[PDB]
Amino acid sequence: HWGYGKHNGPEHWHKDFPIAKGERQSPVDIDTHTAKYDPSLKPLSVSYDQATSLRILNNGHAFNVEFDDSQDKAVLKGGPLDGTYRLIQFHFHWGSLDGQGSEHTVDKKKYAAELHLVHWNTKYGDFGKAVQQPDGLAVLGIFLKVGSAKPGLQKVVDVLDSIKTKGKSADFTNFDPRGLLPESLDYWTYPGSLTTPPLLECVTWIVLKEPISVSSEQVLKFRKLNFNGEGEPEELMVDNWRPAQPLKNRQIKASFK
């Protein structure tokens, strides 16, 4: 099955998932000079006070921190979004070196990692019906650079050694995702897709301009995870990013002048 290796990575995915060569695939490069400020964008609202985290899972591609989405609790609204979107999970993508790791790029610059907070449109009942719709999902994307440690990331880092291999999970209650946000909510937005198979074209992307800073030690611990399962040869979980895809007939809009 699919992955990030030479033999099963991004350049192969189109054979099982033809939408890989679709009209609104992600990630993309954000050309900051071509992005236009959009005065029609409403204020973004990220309301995480009631977020209820449950569990952290190594899925053999990344780790997911999963939330209880059975009530209206951690929601994203405003900006380009119509209505209310409910947080279901977050995960990251990162490199084998600090010079690469993000999926979106900014004027071709790769960050060391990228965080995705995934939300589904509450008009559609749950996530599974939301991914049948062209406005089913909203993903808040946040770049990570290497510098000072991010304190609100450390409880994630400290549980990783308990989910080293594919299929492992751990309790991960009482985690506050507010600690992963930068100060500013300035963002770029465009319509795109999931970035791993099944690559579905359901996502309103909201990519924050301000990166968060994490320490070298925090990202080095991400790189100790494994793609493999327990007992199998070690293949370190690094470089689990899809590169930029053609923009096609899309415009990237800025929330800021």
Ligand X SMILES: O=C(O)c1c(O)cccc1O
Residue 121 binds which of Zn ion, ligand X, none (CB < 5-8 A, kind-dependent): none
- Closest separation in Å from C-beta 139 to ligand X: 6
152 phi, psi to nearest 5 deg: -80, -5
Q: Which stretch binds ligand X (CB under 6 A): 120-128, 145-153, 210-218, 244-252?
A: 120-128
Residue pair 93/101 in contact by the 8 Å Cβ criterion: yes
Active site residue 61: yes
142 phi, psi to nearest 5 deg: -135, 120
- Closest separation in Å from C-beta 113 to Zn ion: 11
Residue pair 121/69 in contact by the 8 Å Cβ criterion: no
Pick the closest to residue 117 from 90, 83, 98 (CA basis). 90
**Judged by CB under 5 A, does residue 104 bind Zn ion?**
no
| 116 labeled part of a ligand binding site | yes
Burial 235-244 (b: 16+ CB within 10 A, else e): eebbbbbbbb
**Judged by CB under 6 A, does residue 175 bind ligand X?**
no
Sign of CA dihedral 103, 194, 48, 45: positive
Cβ closer to ligand X: 22 or 147?
Answer: 22
| 196 labeled part of a ligand binding site | yes
Dist. CA 244–CA 111, nearest whole Å: 13
Residue 162 binds which of Zn ion, ligand X, none (CB < 5-8 A, kind-dependent): none
Helices (H) and strands (E) in the chain, counts: 3, 15
**Judged by CB under 5 A, does residue 61 bind Zn ion?**
no
Q: Which stretch binds ligand X (CB under 6 A): 30-38, 123-131, 161-169, 216-224?
A: 123-131
Among 5, 18, 83, 246, the residue binding ligand X under the rule CB under 6 A is 5
Neighbours of 21 (CB within 10 A): 12
**Judged by CB under 6 A, does residue 150 bind ligand X?**
no
Cβ closer to ligand X: 57 or 214?
Answer: 57
Residue pair 73/52 in contact by the 8 Å Cβ criterion: yes
| 93 labeled part of a ligand binding site | yes
150-179: which residues touch Zn ion (CB under 5 A)?
Answer: none
- Closest separation in Å from C-beta 122 to ligand X: 12
- Closest separation in Å from C-beta 46 to ligand X: 17
| 91 labeled part of a ligand binding site | yes
Which residues are part of the catalytic machinery?
A: 61
